[PDB]
Amino acid sequence: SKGEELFTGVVPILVELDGDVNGHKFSVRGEGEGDATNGKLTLKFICTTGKLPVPWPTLVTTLVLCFSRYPDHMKRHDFFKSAMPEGYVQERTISFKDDGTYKTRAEVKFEGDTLVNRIELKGIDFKEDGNILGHKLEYNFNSHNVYITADKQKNGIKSNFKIRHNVEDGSVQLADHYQQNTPIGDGPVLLPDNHYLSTQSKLSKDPNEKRDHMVLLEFVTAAGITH
Numbered sequence: 727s728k729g730e731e732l733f734t735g736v737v738p739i740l741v742e743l744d745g746d747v748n749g750h751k752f753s754v755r756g757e758g759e760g761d762a763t764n765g766k767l768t769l770k771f772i773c774t775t776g777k778l779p780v781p782w783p784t785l786v787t788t789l790v791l792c793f794s795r796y797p798d799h800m801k802r803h804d805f806f807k808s809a810m811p812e813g814y815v816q817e818r819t820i821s822f823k824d825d826g827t828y829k830t831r832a833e834v835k836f837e838g839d840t841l842v843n844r845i846e847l848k849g850i851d852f853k854e855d856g857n858i859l860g861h862k863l864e865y866n867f868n869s870h871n872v873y874i875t876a877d878k879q880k881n882g883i884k885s886n887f888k889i890r891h892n893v894e895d896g897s898v899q900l901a902d903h904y905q906q907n908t909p910i911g912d913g914p915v916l917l918p919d920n921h922y923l924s925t926q927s928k929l930s931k932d933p934n935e936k937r938d939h940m941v942l943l944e945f946v947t948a949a950g951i952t953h
Contacts, residue, residue, distance in 0.1 A: 727804070727807060727808035727915075727916055728808075728810075729792075729807040729808050729809060729810030729811060730801070730804065730807045730808065730810075732807070732810050732811055732836065733762040733763075733792065733793070733807050733810075734763070735761065735763065736759050736760070736761045737759060737760050737761070737762075737793075737839075737840075737841050738757075738758075738759050738839065738840050738841070739756070739757065739758050739759055739760050739767075739769060739790060739840065739841050739842070739843070740755075740756070740757060740837075740840050740841070740842045740843070741754070741755065741756035741757075741769065741771065741789050741790070741842070741843045741844075741845070742754075742755055742756075742842070742843070742844045742845065743755075743756075743785070743788065743789060743845040743846075743847060744845070744846050744847070745779075745780075745846075745847040745848075745849065746847065746848050746849065747779050747780055747826070747828075747847075747848075747849030747850075747852060747858075747859070748826065748849060748850065748851075748852045748854075748859065750779040751775065752773060752775045752776075752778060752779055753773070753774045753775045754771050754772065754773055754774065754778070754785065754789065755771070755772055755774050756769045756770060756771035756772070756789055756843075756942075757769070757770060758770055760790060760792075760793035760841065761793065762792065762793045762794065762795055762796075762807065763795065764795060765793070765794060765795030765945050765946050765947040766793075766943075766944070766945055767790065767793050767942070767943070767944035767945070767946070768941075768942070768943055768944075769789070769941075769942045769944075770932065770935075770939065770940070770941050770942075771785075771789060771939055771940045771941075771942065772935075772937050772938070772939045773937065773938040773939065774937075776938070777938050778938050779859070780849070780858050780859070780861075781857075781858065781861050781862075781863040781865075781891075782865065782929065782940040783863050783864070783865065783866065783867050783891055783929065784820075784822075784828075784858060784863065784891065784901065785847075785940075786867050786927060786929075786940075786942065787818070787820070787889060787901075787903060788818065788820075788828065788830050788832070788845055788847060789843070789845070789942070790834055790841060790843050791806050791816075791923065791946065792806035792807050792809075792810060792834060792841065793841075793944075793946065794806065794923050794946040794947065794948050795945075795946065795947045795948065796948040797947075797948065797949070799951065799953055800921065800948050800949075800951050802916055802918075803874075803916060803918035803919055803921055803948070803951060804916055804918070804948070805874070805876075805882065805883045805907065805915060805916050805917065805918055806834075806907070808914075808915045808916040809907075809909045809910065809911065809915050810835070810836055811835065811836035812835060812836075812909070812910045812911030812913070813833055813834050813835020813836065813909075813910045813911075814833075814834055814835070814882065814907050814908060814909050814910055815831065815832065815833055815834075815907065815908050815909075815910060816830075816831075816832045816833075816834055816905065816906070816907050817830065817831050817832070817905070817906045817907075817908075818830045818903055818904060818905045818906075819903075819904045820889075820901050820902065820903050820904075821901070821902040821904075822852075822856075822857075822858055822899060822900070822901050822902075823899065823900040823901075823902065824853075824856070825851075825852055825853055825856040825857065825858055825899075826849055826850055826851045826852030826853065826856070826858060826859075827849065827850055827851055828847055828848070828849050829847070829848045829849075829850075830845055830846065830847045830848075831845070831846050832844060832845040832846075833910065835910060857891070857893050857899045858899075862893050862894045862895070862899075863891045863892065863893060863894070863899060864891070864892040864893070864894065865929055866892060866929055867891075867927040867928075867929055868889075868890050868891075868892070869924075869925060869926045869927070870887070870889065870890075870925045871887075871922045871923065871924055871925070872885055872887045872903075872922060872923050872925065873885055873886070873887065873920070873921075873922045874918055874920070874921055874922060874923065875918075875920050876917040876918055876919070876920075877906065877908075878917060880906065880908050881908060881909060881915060881917070882906065882907045882908035882909060882915070882917075883906075883907050883917070883918060884904075884905060884906045884907070885903070885904075885905040886902075886903065886904050886905070887902075887903050887905075888900050888901065888902055888903070889901040889903060919951060920950070921948055921949065921950040921951050922948070922949060922950045923946050923947065923948050923949075924946070924947050924948075924949055925944065925945070925946050926944070926945045927942065927943065927944050927945075928942070928943040928944075929941070929942060930943070
């Protein structure tokens with residue numbers, strides 16, 4: 727694909743989220759860089775409206791899978807890069823078991839030389855005592871495989887998966903993701919055979935930063951295709 731050539735090296739990233747959870751309005755802004763050659767992603771996020779009303783880990787999936795390393799033999803199954811530079815829409819429903827639901831719509835696309843992920847998030851039916859509004863989740867993010875399938879009808883891809891968030895008390899908060907991606911342009915895109923992305927993520931803090939923030943290191947690498 728032509729989009730793919732855009733990802734030949736380190737690409738600078740902008741992320742912008744406008745959120746509303748149970749009425750609590752907040753905004754997140756993130757900056758950094760991605761490298762699809764090595765499947766590597768480094769981002770620093772700041773809650774620009776003050777304290778974040780939800781826990782940072784819950785926003786990880788929402789806050790650029792075009793930066794997944796697709797191995798050479800899988801290059802033809804890389805929807806995400808193929809939709810660039812005009813980009814793609816990534817919509818999700820995230821149901822937190824026994825708790826509220828995020829609904830998200832994002833556009834991931836190049837603006838100038840910068841890959842931008844611009845997100846609207848609405849959160850509803852959250853329990854004030856729950857693990858989310860109650861900030862009961864550990865500051866981390868498990869390794870995880872997410873399965874990608876083609877959606878020929880929508881000319882894109884879809885994915886269902888469960889994210890397991892560790893709770894303080896040693897239990898697990900499940901977050902059921904239903905995901906759909908569709909091209910923003912009307913050019914041709916790569917529709918993949920079934921495969922999955924292998925994710926590892928490291929959450930940390932900038933010791934110099936006073937604002938409520940997350941430093942995120944991510945590796946994502948496609949797999950599951952025979953040869």
